[model samples]
Target chain A: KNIIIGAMTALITPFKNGKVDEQSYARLIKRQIENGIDAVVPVGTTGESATLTHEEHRTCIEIAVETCKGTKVKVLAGAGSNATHQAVGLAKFAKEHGADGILSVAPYYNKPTQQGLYEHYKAIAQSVDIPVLLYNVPGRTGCEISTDTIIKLFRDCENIYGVKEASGNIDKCVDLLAHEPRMMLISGEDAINYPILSNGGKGVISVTSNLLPDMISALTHFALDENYKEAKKINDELYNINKILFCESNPIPIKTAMYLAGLIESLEFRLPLCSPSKENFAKIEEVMKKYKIKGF
Target chain B: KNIIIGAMTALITPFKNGKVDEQSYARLIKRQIENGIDAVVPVGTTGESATLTHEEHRTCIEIAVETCKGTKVKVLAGAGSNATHQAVGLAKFAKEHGADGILSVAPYYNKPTQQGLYEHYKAIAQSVDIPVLLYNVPGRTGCEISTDTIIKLFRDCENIYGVKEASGNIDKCVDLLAHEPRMMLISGEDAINYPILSNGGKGVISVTSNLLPDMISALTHFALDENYKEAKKINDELYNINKILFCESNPIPIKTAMYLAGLIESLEFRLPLCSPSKENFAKIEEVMKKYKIKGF
Candidate 1:
């Protein structure tokens, strides 16, 4: 039941020469576990899910599950697609491969209606025995999963867990938990992790944790322990780096930062998401200098 | 050169028993050819590209290309993906299958920056000798291919043709054409077909055309012939039906309308997109009563 509740990194899949760097990815997941991350999410947006082929997507999930085996760090594999059937297939695969849970985002591009969104998540949740964390990042998806729909999914489906709030609106976060206190809220966005945790969020599925896993883990765990002073201190420390990681589209700056900090072997990215601009790359470097990456 | 300029149908891929309804698909393309459509766009957003498997996507393109062979109607295959490599593969497939051009939508979901978008389209264009029509539907993709980016792609890539403007912004449309008169502008949204045409747009890649190919074809051709009055008349008549087809996220209403009007034998859709709500379905039926579906 606590599988979805904790500091999790929305792990970025490392690629080398247009292939998934299996060794690099395995090491990365190990780093998260060593750094006290509660979970490691594979093939989420932070992992460049859109660009990855099905073979590669499965490989990343397989690596995450394998690497996190025998560890407290659970594997919440990203099993989202604009097509419900595809998401269902991925969810079933994740469950079959022994993932602890699946992070299913609201349908993107097709922009399904609220009823359709409900049906989409419901289908995925029902198809798998694993827990489901409904990802609501409307900014990327072009449509947000409504709180009413989220609450409805929670009520209707047994495996339906809660939402990873990336809408970047704290007000909506408050509104969601206010409507259904039983819903497990997790911070999908890094900047608002403190605010969300303060407002009853159990944890974070973070892009930042891909870098400073220990720091973000400490931030969320401290908040969960109700140590506001220490949590706020870590939150304040992360403010600049958090802002810089999104200087461009997500995973761009984050992956770039990882390479710059010697976390990965290569700075490779799939098309449509090449390297960040000169200025933004410099900004990420400058912001990264403030904090020490744990593994590095 | 004229391949990208025309009255094209952003076709809906019909499914039967969970398989690409090949017979229905072929017949649909044939109907468009018979109905004066200048081209047929397969596997677009309206074609439910997101929900389709790669095999189904390539199958749709092959169907469109095969059906349109030796005809005036060109095949503009929808070959877009957030991953540049995948898009290039699709583009290559489309070209190898004899598609006249490819409608590559701005990378969806990943939300690439402008430079990345330029690179994405540029890579696709360079991959194949076929013309490239950049699709700019921000509402669905979560990022617009800015006018500057479009202009830059057009300038930099010789095979990069104009954009299918579905941003629904007339000012942006006007701004794009004004910046570079050589760029071919096509209307990707139905509601603004007349407006886009009136402002020097060459044609429309229409969802409504999936149902009323002759009517939409006639409207665009009429406007191209400098017959604004007739174009406006058809545009005004189509206003309600055009608005209704998008009552839900595209192809949902359009496909439903086709089913209601008996265009396709079976009413099937992939997951994440289902039947429209009862009220919206009724609205589509009501609006459709006014117009005659020619081939049906």
Candidate 2:
């Protein structure tokens, strides 16, 4: 019965001095809520969950929980890992920290079979009493939660009531909704938020929303209200900007956009995920400037 | 000025009572040594590197180093992680633990761009004195070591000597070797060992070798000697069994195959990577039996 239904920004982690800048991160979430985001997901890929110290990850979730408390904005914590043990630990931690829901991504790197995926989420679902949203971003995770497995998880687990289908396969999305009918689905990709919502998705957990929350949130609301014409207009306005957001592997452009917009203190990333090239930075800066006005 | 030539097994980790079964693991390495394996690479994908604790990872590398200390079988430990810092740390640890070489896998899950890939390995390459083998298994690691990046790293870093290409793309292997003639290319996937070896590649860091070292060693030896007739014979014999080993996502079938063969005390895996299905297990058992008579 629990479904995350609306525009949620997959929040970006603002860093300073090789650590999570709580001051900046809190301010970012505050602005997101002020901009009328439905939910704010922290420690997602955009937040650099991979590089964050485990304690830092929890701190982000705990702070998100604290900032959004008694507010309309919900917190769907990004709690997933390649190892099931790590995913379980992170999921449990997110639940303990009072997150509204847990967005557990499909195990990355060590690509799991569909059975492994089902078993992985099943273990997380069993561990926490909170609502669990299965995230399927195979481009990053390297594996997809097969529609059958998602349906099975929904059928089997009460807490696993929804999925963040970022597989980018529209036919697969249709197959999932048609097969399950009632499963709550969210768009993880930004450009497809309007299209996915039009195709039975509840809303979006977006990367672009990190920069243009008002427009992305409006896009979701418009689509949810069945106003395709308005939604299409907003989508077209954000079309080029969305394409540029992913100009590099995610978070790179999003984080850089925020940095250029003076949203963060330091444009620092942990090693392996360093600063984007100046060329990429200029491209991101150019696109980010085009949408500089209050809302698209 | 760098060469890694011959058949090396990416040894599988053994588990007992929820601990690294040092007894079983050491026994496994001893057998590889006795069978004339060129090297024993521990804590690789086959070794369940994703699941092992940091200490357990170190222990596996330490054991491989200790067991092969006096011998010709080199200990090329798996020292890879998604985080560049961790890869650097692990490479340093492997060198401190007396590893002959380090096999650093391409950053998985949170994939860095090709520039990130280069920076990731470059950081690791600069961290240690021992040789570093860049491992590219997009199937398992979720990211590739691009040919240009590989060439850049090989040309730049003296310690960044070779690569373990397990992308299962033979033309890429041919392209890698052809473009960068000095790059020491090691075959990672078992299925393509013959083709890789025949394509001017050095050797394999094999999974199937965990079960039948002598035959894999024999295959590499024949290929090294330019004896396609003999190499093709061994490859044909292993054709069916190698196909069966991957019936599931690695270590599952390989571990199950070994367990059925009475190699380990028990079939144990960390959370998320559980046992295989009864049907797949049956298939593995049949294949194991077919190849039970020593080496092919």
The residue pairs found clashing in candidate 2 are none
Q: After superposition, how far is residue A129 of candidate 1 from its true place, in Å?
A: 1.5
Model 2, range B1-296, lDDT digits (tens) per residue? Answer: 45455899988989898889998899999988888699988998888888888999889988998899888889898998888877888999998988988888888777788888888888998998888898887865556778999999999999988789878788898889899988788988888788888888888898888888888999999999999889988988998888999998888899998888787879998767788888999999888777853421
Instruction: Give the 10-residue window scoring lowest on summed lDDT in candidate 2 chain A.
Output: A287-296
Give lDDT: candidate 1, residue B167: 86
Question: Could you say which candidate leads in lDDT?
Answer: 1
The residue ranges of model 2 lying beyond 4 angstroms of the native Cα positions read: A293-296, B1-4, B293-296
Candidate 2 structure lDDT? 0.86
lDDT of 2 by residue, A185-214 (tens): 899888787778888888899988888888
DockQ of each: 0.80, 0.66
For residues B6-63, could you state the per-residue lDDT of candidate 1 as single tens digits?
7999999998997899999999899999999998899998898888888888799888
